[PDB]
């Protein structure tokens, strides 16, 4: 799947709101939405921060992403 699709899946599967995540990750809601829509590409550092919000590793986060 696309990385954006994976980001969206990780949130949705955990039943979390954008606002909840964004607050933890210290990013804006619209940036996270853009990430999940594939309108902007995340850096590695961003992936680390989201992985921490989802209680996973970046290794885990990328599973399923070709």
Resolution in A: 1.4
User: Distance between CA 43 and CA 57 in Å, rounded?
Assistant: 15
- Which region holds residue 47: left if phi is over 0, alpha if psi is between -120 and 50, else beta? alpha
At 27, which CATH number? 1.10.260.40
Total domains present in the chain: 1
Q: Nearest 10 degrees: CA dihedral of 54, 15, 20, 46?
A: 30
User: Distance between CA 9 and CA 21 in Å, rounded?
Assistant: 13
Instruction: Give the technique used to solve this structure.
Output: X-ray
Q: Domain span at residue 10?
A: 1-66
User: Distance between CA 28 and CA 57 in Å, rounded?
Assistant: 21
């Amino acid at each position: 799947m696309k990385l954006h699709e994976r980001l969206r899946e990780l949130r949705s599967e955990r039943g979390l709101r954008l606002k909840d995540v964004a607050e933890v990750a210290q990013i804006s809601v619209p940036y996270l939405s853009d990430l999940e829509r594939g309108r902007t590409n995340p850096s590695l550092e961003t992936l680390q921060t989201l992985a921490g919000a989802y209680n996973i590793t970046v290794h885990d986060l990328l599973e399923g992403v070709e």
